């Protein structure tokens, strides 16, 4: 017990990448990104 937590993560970066990869497989558009 008596542990530490914060405004960092757990799955924030993980989830974000799961959801970004979830949207892609689902809501397909006609994309345009700038390199």
């Amino acid at each position: 017990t008596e542990n530490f937590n914060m405004w960092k993560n757990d799955m924030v970066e993980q989830m974000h990448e799961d959801i970004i990869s979830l949207w892609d497989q689902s809501l397909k558009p006609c994309v345009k990104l700038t390199p």
Binding site: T1, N5, W7, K28
Partner: protein, 170 residues
Amino acid sequence: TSVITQACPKVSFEPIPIHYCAPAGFAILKCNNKTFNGTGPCTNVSTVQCTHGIRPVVSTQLLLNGSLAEEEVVIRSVNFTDNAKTIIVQLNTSVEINCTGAGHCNISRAKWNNTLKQIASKLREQFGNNKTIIFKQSSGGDPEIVTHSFNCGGEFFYCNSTQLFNSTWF
């Protein structure tokens, strides 16, 4: 400047509650403090196999279909001092926002004005003993930022919210 022409299809996007369990040789530690407020040494805490039923809803300025506070309205920010940093607000009671493709979203006037004075009872000053709290609307920027954008029934809504954030309290 990569352009991609996919067979843009009319599908229906639906949210599946996603459970996040322990990743490999790691363990998830849920803080049980009913009113845990961001950063800090959580007293009451315990190991769990998976978090909880998290509904991944993508949307702006209004978190929807998610977890409420079981006690009081709890706000959270990395630094309540740096005005540049987002302040998240966890509500006491849910509010409803009914919308249709016909261009509108209606939410109860009484239900929402109440949550406003609740959120007002603790803004930046930090649950400040007292001062004037003002709710104005977006200064500017992208449409997705300036309006409550979200994906309703597969479609992308851009709801003008000047009426939700334009009031004064103390």
